[PDB]
Amino acid sequence: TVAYIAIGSALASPLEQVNAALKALGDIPESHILTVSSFYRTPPLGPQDQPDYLNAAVALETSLAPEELLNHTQRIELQQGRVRKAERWGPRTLDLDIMLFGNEVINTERLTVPHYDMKNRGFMLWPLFEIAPELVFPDGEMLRQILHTRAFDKLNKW
């Protein structure tokens, strides 16, 4: 099963945090990386201008069940990243999201696939389109049509 995973990171030096994360993803049992998108650069949310965020997408072939894959992405987030001390509820310093899991639709208490907001997020869709331009979502919508209709601005490269 081909899973597509969004990776984000702005902490310390994003390039080596993300590279360590990719190595971790590749070491997930019963799984191997098919391809990784380019690394992209997105500005921080808020006017205060935090560090720049590094965004990418990974195609991972896996025979794990979706919740088993979740277990590993959560483990990697714990091992490779941390919580913001002034915002424990805020996003961690390394973000992994399972965007898509084959053609599966999953609405459990722990796991929602497709990612619930990805169709509204250029920073998830553009890297995905780079590695999977002909992708079709479980509901039949084409990735290309979403990017075209919604007219999301392209992302700058890291």
Active site residues: 82, 92, 95, 97
Residue among 1, 71, 111, 138 that touches Cl ion (CB under 5 A): 138
Residue among 91, 137, 144, 158 that touches Cl ion (CB under 5 A): 137
Q: Is 115 in the site for Cl ion (CB under 5 A)?
A: no
In the DSSP assignment, the letter for residue 50 is -
Q: Which range binds Cl ion by CB under 5 A, 1-9, 32-40, 41-49, 138-146?
A: 138-146
d(CA 137, CA 114) in angstroms, rounded, equals: 8
* DSSP per residue, 101-120: ETT--EE-SS-EES-TTGGG
Minimum CB separation from Cl ion for residue 141, in Å?
6
Minimum CB separation from Cl ion for residue 105, in Å?
7
With a CB cutoff of 8 Å and minimum separation 6, the contacts of 135 are 4, 100, 128, 129, 142, 143, 144
Residue with smaller CB distance to Cl ion, 76 or 143: 143
Q: After which residues is the chain broken (C to N over 2.5 A)?
A: none
d(CA 18, CA 95) in angstroms, rounded, equals: 10
Minimum CB separation from Cl ion for residue 108, in Å?
16
Q: Which range binds Cl ion by CB under 5 A, 19-27, 31-39, 88-96, 130-138?
A: 130-138
Q: Would you tell me which residues interact with Cl ion (CB under 5 A)? A: 114, 137-139
